């Protein structure tokens with residue numbers, strides 16, 4: 001996260017780090033035993049975390065039973081850029097580890113709405129990797145502006161942006177997951193090149209079918 005700020009410890013209890021003991025991607029706890037992430041983020045899952053490195057009462061590492069990338073995703077695209085990870089056991093839920101409701105209604109976020117993106121991605125254009133979770137509020141772009149599919153959304157990127165290592169993490173509007181950070185390489189922080197997020201509402205059938 002560029003142009004952001006440190007998150008409050010455990011205030012975003014759905015937030016996962018997909019990890020060789022190293023953070024690779026964000027993810028969102030969406031059920032007791034399932035984390036939603038991005039397709040190219042492919043393995044363990046750290047729940048309950050603020051610091052990656054420091055001991056915390058709520059921190060717990062989970063092995064993954066299986067990884068279910070969207071069947072239509074491809075290594076060279078950011079279409080269908082979703083991944084569902086099943087933990088090897090149901091997560092211990094509490095204040096600090098809690099699923100986030102995700103958008104099932106297929107309607108766009110009002111353009112202009114500030115939504116919240118969190119991650120342990122890089123915090124500058126040198127390689128700088130933060131120990132503690134970062135976040136930033138970002139206005140959602142209208143689809144025409146974003147275009148210049150039905151299944152992607154855009155947010156402004158005027159220095160404040162998602163970037164490398166934020167892939168698979170959340171874009172939250174009004175307490176509901178609306179987007180998942182994309183897992184393709186892109187220039188960050190350039191206003192002319194918006195951040196790109198998978199519109200979770202477009203994938204409602206798919207997510208349900210996996211979790212069914």
Ligand SMILES: NC(=O)c1nn(CC(=O)N2CCC[C@H]2C(=O)NCc2cccc(Cl)c2F)c2ccccc12
Nearest residue numbers: 024040121122162163164165167182183184185186
């Ligand atoms: N949405 C975007 O802005 C964006 N997404 N990616 C892909 C990406 O980060 N990927 C791919 C899957 C794994 C993940 C990855 O490389 N993790 C390893 C990693 C490395 C360094 C630092 C940290 Cl903190 C880190 F976690 C980017 C790549 C470069 C620029 C922008 C982006």
